[PDB]
């Protein structure tokens, strides 16, 4: 009786294990299979899909015990897809040293420790009561359990299969259950009619890879898909010309950037990094490539940070004259500097780079584009400049400045950023402090240091574009995922 939902997608994750699925392509699938203790209600109080309000989900209630622990009271009679009732043991296993953050878990979940809080082992109080703890103070537990790191897995089934096999046959408590995974082709899910929350409205959901955007668009016009993903503002005109189709767009909690291999001689010091950063004309790029729909943030600072968003911050500096001076006073000899890009994996990456190459030519820096295929990122030492993006995954400023740019992150450890000691000291403080003047000011000083050092250069917050049949009602949310709970209906 319910319609089957057909999605034309850009790609699929290599695993359906919820943490290993973290990417631009995984969350739209794993958000259906699993649930979290606390859920973010993006549509709360009439918000246009960007609210940061947190509501009960698998946890009916919770109570903070002290500076490092929160006791959760679980919803009762919740069923995993295989008919196993959800208990405190499943939640304890989800946040355990064994599965997630411990030294053994590292080979199974590569970002398990990197993206997690400083967890201590959870405590099971009774069948429906579990306490999550951190080894050092953390006022981020509640916020973290509403994030993409926190989908609840079943203990017994996950242990039996192991992380790899679980990723190929996942079981969760979510509104849709697993049917099929054809690697590099399609994922099929079916309605979980035992779901504890709003009943699924589609009988089935198929995530079909259609690699090229023009082919994805043709698929929607051909009547092959109900919703297609990964379009840009340039597609709006064509789609909306069809009486039965329309685009649905939103800014997402992510930023596009370029960064440097600071192990390379030319990028060890901040001089040329700053020169390149100061020559980036973001307003022209936003108008030219995004139809003014992308947003230029005032620093490493986004509205989803909530209490740690600073709406009064000064804009990131644009100064061609200073940029020219810096190149001249730096060691820079005019030798071409490479900038690696995985084609247009980041929307508009190649035209954005063409524009920046001209801005850089004008200050006396010769930058050359280099492309690579998926899974072929070059050996680190063969790279100089490269593009990147970071999904801002917490309703708090902790992510991604601390896990990516902090003392434990890849920018310093793999990419050679020798961050000022003050920056690392502040990363530690914001990790352990509650919200207040000290934590708020620490993020602003970290944002200032980030701009002064230029280990990366923020371009903008992208504007994601979907296209859909007008008969299929579904609203985008401000994140790299698709939400169907109370947000998918047909007719």
CSV table of C-alpha atoms in Angstrom, one decimal:
chain,number,residue,atom,x,y,z
A,1,UNK,CA,0.0,0.0,0.0
A,2,UNK,CA,2.8,2.5,0.9
A,3,UNK,CA,4.9,3.8,-2.0
A,4,UNK,CA,8.5,2.6,-2.4
A,5,UNK,CA,10.9,5.5,-2.3
A,6,UNK,CA,13.5,5.7,-5.0
A,7,UNK,CA,16.6,7.8,-4.4
A,8,UNK,CA,19.1,8.7,-7.1
A,9,UNK,CA,22.4,9.3,-5.1
A,10,UNK,CA,26.0,10.4,-5.7
A,11,UNK,CA,27.5,7.4,-4.0
A,12,UNK,CA,27.4,4.9,-1.1
A,13,UNK,CA,29.6,4.4,2.1
A,14,UNK,CA,31.9,1.4,2.1
A,15,UNK,CA,30.2,0.2,5.4
A,16,UNK,CA,26.8,0.5,7.1
A,17,UNK,CA,28.5,0.3,10.6
A,18,UNK,CA,27.2,3.8,11.8
A,19,UNK,CA,30.5,5.4,12.7
A,20,UNK,CA,32.4,3.9,9.7
A,21,UNK,CA,29.5,5.2,7.5
A,22,UNK,CA,30.4,8.9,8.5
A,23,UNK,CA,30.8,10.7,5.2
A,24,UNK,CA,28.7,12.8,2.8
A,25,UNK,CA,26.9,9.5,1.5
A,26,UNK,CA,26.5,7.3,4.7
A,27,UNK,CA,24.3,9.3,7.2
A,28,UNK,CA,21.3,9.5,4.8
A,29,UNK,CA,21.3,5.7,5.1
A,30,UNK,CA,22.4,5.0,8.7
A,31,UNK,CA,19.9,7.7,10.0
A,32,UNK,CA,17.2,5.2,8.9
A,33,UNK,CA,18.6,2.0,10.3
A,34,UNK,CA,19.5,3.4,13.7
A,35,UNK,CA,18.5,5.7,16.5
A,36,UNK,CA,20.4,7.8,19.1
A,37,UNK,CA,19.7,8.3,22.9
A,38,UNK,CA,18.8,12.0,22.2
A,39,UNK,CA,17.6,13.2,18.8
A,40,UNK,CA,18.1,16.6,17.1
A,41,UNK,CA,14.7,18.0,16.0
A,42,UNK,CA,15.7,20.1,13.0
A,43,UNK,CA,12.1,21.3,12.5
A,44,UNK,CA,11.5,22.4,16.2
A,45,UNK,CA,9.4,25.5,16.7
A,46,UNK,CA,8.8,26.0,13.0
A,47,UNK,CA,12.5,26.2,12.1
A,48,UNK,CA,13.4,25.7,8.4
A,49,UNK,CA,15.2,22.4,9.0
A,50,UNK,CA,18.1,24.0,11.0
A,51,UNK,CA,17.0,23.9,14.6
A,52,UNK,CA,19.5,22.7,17.3
A,53,UNK,CA,16.8,21.6,19.8
A,54,UNK,CA,17.5,18.2,21.4
A,55,UNK,CA,14.6,15.9,22.3
A,56,UNK,CA,14.2,12.4,23.9
A,57,UNK,CA,14.6,9.4,21.5
A,58,UNK,CA,16.0,6.0,22.8
A,59,UNK,CA,16.5,7.8,26.2
A,60,UNK,CA,13.1,8.8,27.6
A,61,UNK,CA,15.0,11.0,30.1
A,62,UNK,CA,18.5,11.8,31.4
A,63,UNK,CA,20.1,13.5,34.4
A,64,UNK,CA,23.6,14.9,34.6
A,65,UNK,CA,25.2,13.4,37.8
A,66,UNK,CA,28.4,15.6,37.9
A,67,UNK,CA,31.0,17.2,35.6
A,68,UNK,CA,31.9,13.8,33.9
A,69,UNK,CA,28.7,11.7,33.9
A,70,UNK,CA,25.1,11.5,32.7
A,71,UNK,CA,22.6,8.8,33.7
A,72,UNK,CA,20.1,7.8,30.9
A,73,UNK,CA,16.7,6.2,31.5
A,74,UNK,CA,15.9,4.2,28.4
A,75,UNK,CA,12.6,3.7,26.5
A,76,UNK,CA,11.2,0.3,27.3
A,77,UNK,CA,10.1,-2.5,24.8
A,78,UNK,CA,12.2,-1.0,21.9
A,79,UNK,CA,12.9,-3.6,19.4
A,80,UNK,CA,16.1,-4.1,17.3
A,81,UNK,CA,15.1,-5.4,13.7
A,82,UNK,CA,15.9,-9.0,14.7
A,83,UNK,CA,13.4,-8.9,17.6
A,84,UNK,CA,16.0,-8.4,20.4
A,85,UNK,CA,14.7,-5.9,23.0
A,86,UNK,CA,17.0,-2.8,23.5
A,87,UNK,CA,18.6,-2.7,27.0
A,88,UNK,CA,21.3,-0.8,28.9
A,89,UNK,CA,23.9,-3.4,27.8
A,90,UNK,CA,23.5,-2.4,24.1
A,91,UNK,CA,24.0,1.3,25.0
A,92,UNK,CA,27.0,0.4,27.3
A,93,UNK,CA,28.5,-1.6,24.4
A,94,UNK,CA,28.0,1.3,21.9
A,95,UNK,CA,30.1,3.6,24.0
A,96,UNK,CA,32.6,1.0,25.2
A,97,UNK,CA,36.5,0.9,25.1
A,98,UNK,CA,36.1,-2.5,23.2
A,99,UNK,CA,33.8,-1.2,20.4
A,100,UNK,CA,34.5,2.5,20.1
A,101,UNK,CA,37.4,4.4,21.7
A,102,UNK,CA,39.9,1.9,23.1
A,103,UNK,CA,43.2,0.8,21.5
A,104,UNK,CA,41.7,-2.5,20.1
A,105,UNK,CA,38.7,-0.7,18.6
A,106,UNK,CA,41.1,1.6,16.5
A,107,UNK,CA,41.6,-1.0,13.6
A,108,UNK,CA,37.8,-1.7,13.5
A,109,UNK,CA,36.6,2.0,13.8
A,110,UNK,CA,39.5,4.3,12.6
A,111,UNK,CA,37.8,7.5,13.8
A,112,UNK,CA,36.4,5.9,17.0
A,113,UNK,CA,38.9,7.5,19.4
A,114,UNK,CA,39.6,10.7,17.2
A,115,UNK,CA,35.9,11.8,17.1
A,116,UNK,CA,34.8,10.6,20.5
A,117,UNK,CA,34.9,12.4,23.8
A,118,UNK,CA,37.5,11.3,26.5
A,119,UNK,CA,35.2,8.4,27.5
A,120,UNK,CA,35.5,6.1,30.5
A,121,UNK,CA,33.7,2.8,30.4
A,122,UNK,CA,29.9,3.2,30.7
A,123,UNK,CA,28.1,1.9,33.8
A,124,UNK,CA,25.0,-0.3,33.5
A,125,UNK,CA,22.8,0.5,36.6
A,126,UNK,CA,19.8,-1.8,35.6
A,127,UNK,CA,18.0,-3.2,32.5
A,128,UNK,CA,16.9,0.4,31.4
A,129,UNK,CA,19.5,2.6,33.1
A,130,UNK,CA,23.0,3.4,31.9
A,131,UNK,CA,25.5,6.1,32.9
A,132,UNK,CA,27.9,7.5,30.3
A,133,UNK,CA,31.1,8.9,31.7
A,134,UNK,CA,34.3,10.7,30.7
A,135,UNK,CA,37.8,10.4,32.3
A,136,UNK,CA,38.2,14.2,32.5
A,137,UNK,CA,35.3,16.7,32.8
A,138,UNK,CA,33.0,17.0,29.8
A,139,UNK,CA,29.9,19.1,29.5
A,140,UNK,CA,29.5,17.7,26.0
A,141,UNK,CA,28.0,14.2,26.8
A,142,UNK,CA,24.4,15.2,26.1
A,143,UNK,CA,25.3,17.1,22.8
A,144,UNK,CA,27.5,14.2,21.7
A,145,UNK,CA,24.8,11.5,22.2
A,146,UNK,CA,22.6,13.5,19.7
A,147,UNK,CA,25.4,13.3,17.0
A,148,UNK,CA,26.4,10.9,14.1
A,149,UNK,CA,29.0,9.3,16.4
A,150,UNK,CA,26.2,8.0,18.7
A,151,UNK,CA,23.9,5.6,16.9
A,152,UNK,CA,23.0,2.7,19.1
A,153,UNK,CA,24.2,-0.8,18.0
A,154,UNK,CA,23.0,-4.2,19.4
A,155,UNK,CA,25.7,-5.8,21.7
A,156,UNK,CA,25.2,-9.5,21.0
A,157,UNK,CA,24.7,-9.3,17.3
A,158,UNK,CA,27.5,-6.8,16.7
A,159,UNK,CA,29.9,-8.9,18.9
A,160,UNK,CA,28.9,-12.1,16.9
A,161,UNK,CA,29.5,-10.6,13.5
A,162,UNK,CA,32.3,-8.1,14.3
A,163,UNK,CA,32.5,-4.5,12.9
A,164,UNK,CA,33.3,-5.6,9.3
A,165,UNK,CA,30.4,-8.1,8.9
A,166,UNK,CA,28.1,-5.9,10.9
A,167,UNK,CA,28.8,-3.1,8.3
A,168,UNK,CA,27.4,-5.5,5.6
A,169,UNK,CA,24.3,-6.7,7.5
A,170,UNK,CA,23.4,-4.0,10.0
A,171,UNK,CA,20.7,-4.3,12.7
A,172,UNK,CA,19.3,-1.3,14.5
A,173,UNK,CA,16.2,0.1,16.1
A,174,UNK,CA,15.5,2.6,13.3
A,175,UNK,CA,12.3,3.2,11.2
A,176,UNK,CA,13.8,1.2,8.2
A,177,UNK,CA,15.5,-2.2,8.3
A,178,UNK,CA,18.3,-3.5,6.1
A,179,UNK,CA,17.5,-5.6,3.0
A,180,UNK,CA,20.5,-5.5,0.6
A,181,UNK,CA,23.9,-3.8,0.0
A,182,UNK,CA,25.4,-4.2,-3.5
A,183,UNK,CA,28.8,-2.5,-3.1
A,184,UNK,CA,29.2,0.5,-5.4
A,185,UNK,CA,25.7,0.1,-6.7
A,186,UNK,CA,22.6,0.2,-4.4
A,187,UNK,CA,21.4,-0.1,-0.8
A,188,UNK,CA,17.8,-1.3,-0.2
A,189,UNK,CA,15.9,-0.8,3.1
A,190,UNK,CA,12.3,-1.8,4.1
A,191,UNK,CA,9.8,-0.3,6.6
A,192,UNK,CA,10.3,-1.4,10.2
A,193,UNK,CA,6.7,-1.6,11.3
A,194,UNK,CA,7.7,-2.5,14.9
A,195,UNK,CA,9.3,1.1,15.1
A,196,UNK,CA,8.8,2.7,18.6
A,197,UNK,CA,8.4,6.3,17.0
A,198,UNK,CA,6.4,7.7,14.0
A,199,UNK,CA,5.5,4.8,11.7
A,200,UNK,CA,7.6,4.6,8.4
A,201,UNK,CA,5.6,6.0,5.4
A,202,UNK,CA,7.6,4.3,2.6
A,203,UNK,CA,7.3,0.5,2.1
A,204,UNK,CA,10.9,0.4,0.9
A,205,UNK,CA,13.8,2.8,0.2
A,206,UNK,CA,16.4,2.3,-2.5
A,207,UNK,CA,19.6,4.3,-2.6
A,208,UNK,CA,20.8,3.9,-6.2
A,209,UNK,CA,24.1,5.3,-7.3
A,210,UNK,CA,23.9,7.5,-10.4
A,211,UNK,CA,27.5,9.0,-10.5
A,212,UNK,CA,27.1,12.0,-12.9
A,213,UNK,CA,24.8,14.9,-11.9
A,214,UNK,CA,23.4,15.3,-15.5
A,215,UNK,CA,22.5,11.5,-15.5
A,216,UNK,CA,20.9,11.9,-12.0
A,217,UNK,CA,18.8,14.9,-13.3
A,218,UNK,CA,17.8,12.8,-16.4
A,219,UNK,CA,16.7,10.0,-14.1
A,220,UNK,CA,14.4,12.3,-12.2
A,221,UNK,CA,12.9,13.7,-15.5
A,222,UNK,CA,12.6,10.1,-16.8
A,223,UNK,CA,10.5,9.2,-13.8
A,224,UNK,CA,13.1,6.7,-12.4
A,225,UNK,CA,13.6,8.6,-9.0
A,226,UNK,CA,11.4,10.3,-6.5
A,227,UNK,CA,14.4,12.4,-5.0
A,228,UNK,CA,17.9,13.0,-6.3
A,229,UNK,CA,20.8,14.3,-4.3
A,230,UNK,CA,24.0,16.3,-4.8
A,231,UNK,CA,23.0,19.0,-7.2
A,232,UNK,CA,24.1,22.7,-7.2
A,233,UNK,CA,22.4,26.1,-7.6
A,234,UNK,CA,23.2,25.8,-11.4
A,235,UNK,CA,20.7,23.0,-11.7
A,236,UNK,CA,17.8,25.0,-10.3
A,237,UNK,CA,16.7,26.6,-13.6
A,238,UNK,CA,16.4,23.4,-15.5
A,239,UNK,CA,14.6,21.4,-12.8
A,240,UNK,CA,12.1,24.0,-11.8
A,241,UNK,CA,11.0,24.4,-15.4
A,242,UNK,CA,9.2,21.0,-15.0
A,243,UNK,CA,5.6,21.5,-13.6
A,244,UNK,CA,5.9,18.2,-11.6
A,245,UNK,CA,9.5,18.7,-10.2
A,246,UNK,CA,11.2,21.1,-8.0
A,247,UNK,CA,14.5,21.7,-6.2
A,248,UNK,CA,14.8,21.8,-2.4
A,249,UNK,CA,17.9,23.4,-1.0
A,250,UNK,CA,19.6,24.4,2.2
A,251,UNK,CA,22.9,25.6,3.7
A,252,UNK,CA,24.5,22.6,5.4
A,253,UNK,CA,26.6,22.5,8.6
A,254,UNK,CA,29.9,22.0,6.7
A,255,UNK,CA,32.6,24.2,5.3
A,256,UNK,CA,34.7,24.0,2.1
A,257,UNK,CA,38.3,24.9,2.5
A,258,UNK,CA,41.8,24.5,1.2
A,259,UNK,CA,44.8,23.5,3.3
A,260,UNK,CA,48.5,22.8,3.2
A,261,UNK,CA,51.1,20.1,3.7
A,262,UNK,CA,53.1,22.0,6.3
A,263,UNK,CA,55.9,19.3,6.2
A,264,UNK,CA,56.8,20.9,2.8
A,265,UNK,CA,59.6,23.6,3.0
A,266,UNK,CA,57.4,26.4,1.4
A,267,UNK,CA,54.6,25.9,3.9
A,268,UNK,CA,56.5,25.3,7.2
A,269,UNK,CA,56.2,29.0,8.2
A,270,UNK,CA,52.9,31.0,8.1
A,271,UNK,CA,54.0,33.7,5.6
A,272,UNK,CA,53.0,32.1,2.2
A,273,UNK,CA,50.0,30.4,3.8
A,274,UNK,CA,48.8,33.9,5.0
A,275,UNK,CA,49.6,35.5,1.5
A,276,UNK,CA,47.4,32.9,-0.2
A,277,UNK,CA,44.6,33.2,2.4
A,278,UNK,CA,44.6,37.1,2.1
A,279,UNK,CA,44.2,37.0,-1.7
A,280,UNK,CA,40.9,34.8,-1.6
A,281,UNK,CA,38.0,37.0,-2.8
A,282,UNK,CA,35.2,34.9,-1.3
A,283,UNK,CA,32.2,37.2,-2.4
A,284,UNK,CA,33.1,36.9,-6.1
A,285,UNK,CA,33.3,33.0,-5.7
A,286,UNK,CA,30.0,32.9,-3.9
A,287,UNK,CA,28.2,35.0,-6.6
A,288,UNK,CA,30.0,33.3,-9.6
A,289,UNK,CA,29.5,29.7,-8.5
A,290,UNK,CA,26.8,29.5,-5.9
A,291,UNK,CA,24.3,32.2,-7.1
A,292,UNK,CA,25.0,33.9,-3.8
A,293,UNK,CA,23.4,30.9,-2.0
A,294,UNK,CA,26.6,29.7,-0.1
A,295,UNK,CA,27.4,31.6,3.1
A,296,UNK,CA,30.7,33.2,4.1
A,297,UNK,CA,31.2,32.6,7.8
A,298,UNK,CA,32.9,35.1,10.1
A,299,UNK,CA,35.7,32.6,10.9
A,300,UNK,CA,35.6,29.0,12.1
A,301,UNK,CA,32.2,29.9,13.6
A,302,UNK,CA,28.8,28.6,12.5
A,303,UNK,CA,25.2,29.1,13.8
A,304,UNK,CA,24.7,25.3,14.8
A,305,UNK,CA,27.4,26.0,17.5
A,306,UNK,CA,24.5,27.6,19.5
A,307,UNK,CA,26.0,28.9,22.8
A,308,UNK,CA,29.5,28.9,21.1
A,309,UNK,CA,28.4,30.7,17.9
A,310,UNK,CA,29.6,34.3,17.9
A,311,UNK,CA,27.2,36.4,15.6
A,312,UNK,CA,29.3,39.6,16.2
A,313,UNK,CA,32.7,38.2,15.0
A,314,UNK,CA,34.6,40.3,12.3
A,315,UNK,CA,34.8,39.0,8.8
A,316,UNK,CA,37.9,37.0,7.7
A,317,UNK,CA,40.4,39.4,6.1
A,318,UNK,CA,40.7,40.1,2.4
A,319,UNK,CA,43.8,42.2,1.6
A,320,UNK,CA,45.5,41.9,-1.8
A,321,UNK,CA,48.1,44.6,-1.0
A,322,UNK,CA,49.3,42.7,2.2
A,323,UNK,CA,49.2,39.4,0.3
A,324,UNK,CA,51.6,40.9,-2.4
A,325,UNK,CA,54.0,42.1,0.4
A,326,UNK,CA,54.0,38.7,2.1
A,327,UNK,CA,54.9,36.8,-1.1
A,328,UNK,CA,57.8,39.3,-1.8
A,329,UNK,CA,59.2,39.0,1.7
A,330,UNK,CA,58.8,35.2,1.9
A,331,UNK,CA,61.3,32.7,0.4
A,332,UNK,CA,58.9,32.1,-2.6
A,333,UNK,CA,60.9,31.8,-5.9
A,334,UNK,CA,58.0,31.5,-8.4
A,335,UNK,CA,58.2,27.7,-8.7
A,336,UNK,CA,54.7,26.2,-9.4
A,337,UNK,CA,52.8,25.0,-6.3
A,338,UNK,CA,50.4,22.0,-6.9
A,339,UNK,CA,46.8,22.0,-5.5
A,340,UNK,CA,45.2,18.5,-5.5
A,341,UNK,CA,41.5,18.0,-6.0
A,342,UNK,CA,39.4,14.8,-6.4
A,343,UNK,CA,37.7,16.4,-9.4
A,344,UNK,CA,34.4,18.0,-8.2
A,345,UNK,CA,33.9,15.8,-5.1
A,346,UNK,CA,33.4,19.2,-3.4
A,347,UNK,CA,30.7,21.0,-5.5
A,348,UNK,CA,32.4,23.7,-7.7
A,349,UNK,CA,35.9,22.6,-6.6
A,350,UNK,CA,37.5,22.9,-10.0
A,351,UNK,CA,35.9,26.3,-11.1
A,352,UNK,CA,36.6,27.6,-7.5
A,353,UNK,CA,40.3,26.6,-8.0
A,354,UNK,CA,40.4,28.2,-11.5
A,355,UNK,CA,39.2,31.5,-9.9
A,356,UNK,CA,41.7,31.3,-7.0
A,357,UNK,CA,44.6,30.4,-9.4
A,358,UNK,CA,44.0,33.9,-11.1
A,359,UNK,CA,43.7,35.6,-7.7
A,360,UNK,CA,47.1,34.0,-6.8
A,361,UNK,CA,48.7,34.8,-10.1
A,362,UNK,CA,47.9,38.5,-9.4
A,363,UNK,CA,49.9,38.4,-6.1
A,364,UNK,CA,52.8,36.6,-7.8
A,365,UNK,CA,52.1,32.9,-6.8
A,366,UNK,CA,52.0,30.2,-9.5
A,367,UNK,CA,49.4,27.5,-8.5
A,368,UNK,CA,48.7,24.5,-10.7
A,369,UNK,CA,45.7,22.1,-10.5
A,370,UNK,CA,46.4,18.3,-10.0
A,371,UNK,CA,43.6,15.8,-10.0
A,372,UNK,CA,43.3,12.4,-8.5
A,373,UNK,CA,40.7,9.6,-8.7
A,374,UNK,CA,38.7,8.3,-5.6
A,375,UNK,CA,40.9,6.1,-3.5
A,376,UNK,CA,44.0,7.5,-5.2
A,377,UNK,CA,44.9,10.4,-2.8
A,378,UNK,CA,48.7,10.8,-3.5
A,379,UNK,CA,51.5,9.9,-1.0
A,380,UNK,CA,51.5,12.9,1.5
A,381,UNK,CA,54.9,14.1,0.4
A,382,UNK,CA,53.8,14.5,-3.2
A,383,UNK,CA,51.1,17.0,-2.1
A,384,UNK,CA,51.4,20.8,-1.3
A,385,UNK,CA,48.0,22.5,-1.4
A,386,UNK,CA,44.8,20.5,-1.4
A,387,UNK,CA,41.0,21.1,-0.9
A,388,UNK,CA,39.0,19.6,2.0
A,389,UNK,CA,35.8,20.1,3.9
A,390,UNK,CA,34.6,19.5,7.5
A,391,UNK,CA,31.1,18.5,8.5
A,392,UNK,CA,30.3,20.6,11.7
A,393,UNK,CA,28.8,17.6,13.5
A,394,UNK,CA,28.1,18.9,17.0
A,395,UNK,CA,25.6,21.5,18.1
A,396,UNK,CA,28.7,23.1,19.8
A,397,UNK,CA,32.0,24.6,18.6
A,398,UNK,CA,34.0,21.6,19.9
A,399,UNK,CA,33.7,20.0,16.4
A,400,UNK,CA,35.6,20.3,14.1
A,401,UNK,CA,38.2,22.8,15.4
A,402,UNK,CA,39.3,20.5,18.3
A,403,UNK,CA,39.3,17.0,16.7
A,404,UNK,CA,40.7,18.1,13.3
A,405,UNK,CA,42.9,21.1,14.2
A,406,UNK,CA,43.7,20.3,17.8
A,407,UNK,CA,46.8,18.7,19.3
A,408,UNK,CA,45.5,15.2,18.7
A,409,UNK,CA,44.3,15.9,15.2
A,410,UNK,CA,45.7,15.1,11.7
A,411,UNK,CA,46.4,18.8,10.7
A,412,UNK,CA,49.2,18.9,13.4
A,413,UNK,CA,50.2,15.2,13.6
A,414,UNK,CA,50.1,14.2,9.9
A,415,UNK,CA,50.2,17.5,8.1
A,416,UNK,CA,52.9,19.2,10.2
A,417,UNK,CA,51.1,22.3,11.6
A,418,UNK,CA,53.3,23.5,14.4
A,419,UNK,CA,50.4,25.2,16.3
A,420,UNK,CA,51.3,27.9,18.9
A,421,UNK,CA,51.2,26.3,22.4
A,422,UNK,CA,48.4,28.7,23.4
A,423,UNK,CA,46.2,27.2,20.7
A,424,UNK,CA,46.6,23.7,22.1
A,425,UNK,CA,46.2,24.9,25.7
A,426,UNK,CA,42.8,26.4,24.6
A,427,UNK,CA,41.7,23.2,22.8
A,428,UNK,CA,42.2,21.4,26.2
A,429,UNK,CA,40.2,24.1,28.1
A,430,UNK,CA,37.2,24.1,25.7
A,431,UNK,CA,37.1,20.3,25.9
A,432,UNK,CA,36.7,20.3,29.7
A,433,UNK,CA,35.0,23.6,30.5
A,434,UNK,CA,31.2,24.2,30.9
A,435,UNK,CA,29.7,27.0,28.8
A,436,UNK,CA,30.4,30.5,30.1
A,437,UNK,CA,32.6,33.6,29.4
A,438,UNK,CA,35.9,31.6,29.7
A,439,UNK,CA,34.9,28.9,27.2
A,440,UNK,CA,33.2,31.4,24.8
A,441,UNK,CA,36.3,33.7,24.8
A,442,UNK,CA,38.7,30.6,24.4
A,443,UNK,CA,36.9,29.7,21.1
A,444,UNK,CA,37.2,33.3,19.9
A,445,UNK,CA,41.0,33.3,20.7
A,446,UNK,CA,41.4,29.9,18.9
A,447,UNK,CA,39.5,31.4,15.9
A,448,UNK,CA,41.9,34.4,15.9
A,449,UNK,CA,45.0,32.1,16.1
A,450,UNK,CA,43.5,29.9,13.3
A,451,UNK,CA,43.2,33.1,11.0
A,452,UNK,CA,46.7,34.3,12.0
A,453,UNK,CA,48.4,30.9,11.3
A,454,UNK,CA,46.3,29.9,8.3
A,455,UNK,CA,46.8,26.0,8.7
A,456,UNK,CA,43.7,26.0,6.4
A,457,UNK,CA,41.6,28.7,4.7
A,458,UNK,CA,37.8,28.6,5.0
A,459,UNK,CA,36.0,29.4,1.8
A,460,UNK,CA,32.3,29.1,2.6
A,461,UNK,CA,29.4,27.1,3.9
A,462,UNK,CA,28.0,25.3,0.8
A,463,UNK,CA,24.4,25.3,-0.3
A,464,UNK,CA,23.2,21.7,-0.9
A,465,UNK,CA,20.6,21.2,-3.6
A,466,UNK,CA,18.2,18.2,-3.9
A,467,UNK,CA,15.5,17.7,-6.6
A,468,UNK,CA,12.2,15.9,-6.1
A,469,UNK,CA,8.8,15.0,-7.5
A,470,UNK,CA,6.3,17.6,-6.2
A,471,UNK,CA,4.0,14.7,-5.1
A,472,UNK,CA,6.8,13.4,-2.7
A,473,UNK,CA,6.8,15.8,0.4
A,474,UNK,CA,10.2,15.9,2.2
A,475,UNK,CA,12.2,18.8,3.5
A,476,UNK,CA,16.0,18.9,3.6
A,477,UNK,CA,17.8,19.5,7.0
A,478,UNK,CA,20.9,21.7,7.4
A,479,UNK,CA,23.2,18.6,7.5
A,480,UNK,CA,24.8,16.0,5.2
A,481,UNK,CA,21.9,13.5,5.8
A,482,UNK,CA,18.2,13.0,5.0
A,483,UNK,CA,15.5,12.8,7.7
A,484,UNK,CA,12.2,11.0,7.0
A,485,UNK,CA,10.7,10.9,10.6
A,486,UNK,CA,7.6,13.1,10.4
A,487,UNK,CA,9.1,14.3,7.1
A,488,UNK,CA,8.1,12.0,4.3
A,489,UNK,CA,4.6,11.7,2.7
A,490,UNK,CA,3.2,10.8,-0.7
A,491,UNK,CA,0.1,11.7,-2.9
